[PDB]
């Protein structure tokens, strides 16, 4: 029943997210049983990743270059910016192997329920990328959560002042889904925004 | 191992989808413990259901009369016809509680593999409905499936000879979904369908 140096590893493991008490408890032990090196590997990593954390110059992404392989390359149109939230979104998006523009990660979303609001999210710096208006279109592709929508709903308030196209990601019926199992809200959007064949 | 009257029920039930042998067993005993009269009411509904079933002469939906309780009602908008694949779809779409038009059931999708061609689903009646009626809008609400796509794109060539607005249900991100787990073909459309503001 959890001696010190352990009632903290736990205490601090169970602050990581998707890590319940259960888990911080279970997980902590496996750890004390790993061979020393392994723990030092683990530990170093947790701290090396942080000591070398590279933020993109243009797009605030987390590549290992000062300027991301996406923002470098001269085929990518630095004039359509695709807003997102997470380094991970960016990989998702590039898998559609169709995007031409460049990204702007914000590193989260605006949920006054997790510990956040405009400041902690790279919005301030997004505006400055278009302050000169040498971007034709922003594409705000966060999630269609109340997460995503907050942020988007009004990032697009702020991009009003500038001479830009502020397009939002399309909402509707996923492909390979069918109408019989689709939510009533997904459905009404799908319906009231019908893409005139 | 159970009685023989009961084997049968079990079995018979187990052929209905969504009920496996644990459940085909459970309901078998529940059913046969309720009063005779209730037990007779299922038995009854089950039978009068199938017997009484008919399709409307206009939209080919499943109804009880000659004309869908929808088309029989004359203050819905007979201008806009919401093509849709199956009778259960119309139920979906109707629970959305916004569409004011009328349907046309096709009863299937052009499916070279099933053997079903275009003259095997109520597609012609649709032309007739639209050639002879005064039709403003012919919404296509088939599924985003491969087969369901082909269909809506077949019907839509047919309808350009005529002078009508052929719209399609919007394909995109299912509301309250996430970018990380949405698949690429949905994404590439979410993004390609992007809409201003
Ligand atoms: Zn970059
Ligand atoms: Zn009808």
Curated annotation (Swiss-Prot), chains A, B:
Cysteines joined through disulfide linkages: none
Gene3D superfamilies found in the cross-reference section: 3.30.60.80, 3.40.1360.10, 6.10.250.240, RecR Domain 1 (1.10.8.420)
SMART domains membership: HhH1 (SM00278), TOPRIM (SM00493)
Keyword DNA repair: yes
Keyword flag Zinc-finger: yes
Alphabetized PROSITE patterns for the sequence: RECR, TOPRIM
Toprim domain span: 79-174
Zn-finger (C4-type) residues: 56-71
Biological function: May play a role in DNA repair. It seems to be involved in an RecBC-independent recombinational process of DNA repair. It may act with RecF and RecO.
HAMAP family per the UniProt record, alphabetical: RecR (MF_00017)
Protein name according to UniProt: Recombination protein RecR
Source species of the chain: Caldanaerobacter subterraneus subsp. tengcongensis (strain DSM 15242 / JCM 11007 / NBRC 100824 / MB4)
């Amino acid at each position: 029943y959890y001696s010190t140096s352990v009632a903290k590893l736990i205490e601090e493991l169970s602050k990581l997210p998707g890590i319940g008490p259960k888990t911080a408890q279970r997980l902590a032990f496996f750890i004390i049983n790993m061979p020393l090196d392994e723990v030092r590997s683990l530990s170093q990593a947790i701290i090396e990743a942080k000591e070398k954390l590279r933020y993109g110059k243009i797009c605030f992404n987390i590549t290992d270059k000062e300027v991301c392989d996406i923002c470098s390359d001269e085929n990518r149109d630095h004039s359509t910016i695709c807003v997102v939230s997470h380094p991970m979104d960016v990989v998702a998006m590039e898998k559609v192997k169709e995007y031409k523009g460049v990204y702007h990660v914000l590193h989260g979303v605006i949920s006054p329920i997790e510990g956040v609001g405009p400041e902690d999210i790279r919005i301030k710096e997004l505006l400055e990328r278009v302050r000169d208006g040498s971007v034709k279109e922003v594409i705000l592709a966060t999630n269609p959560d109340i997460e995503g929508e907050a942020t988007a709903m009004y990032i697009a308030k702020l991009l009003k002042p500038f001479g830009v196209k502020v397009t939002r990601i399309a909402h509707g019926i996923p492909v390979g889904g069918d109408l019989e199992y689709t939510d009533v809200v997904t459905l009404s959007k799908a319906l009231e925004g019908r893409r005139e064949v």
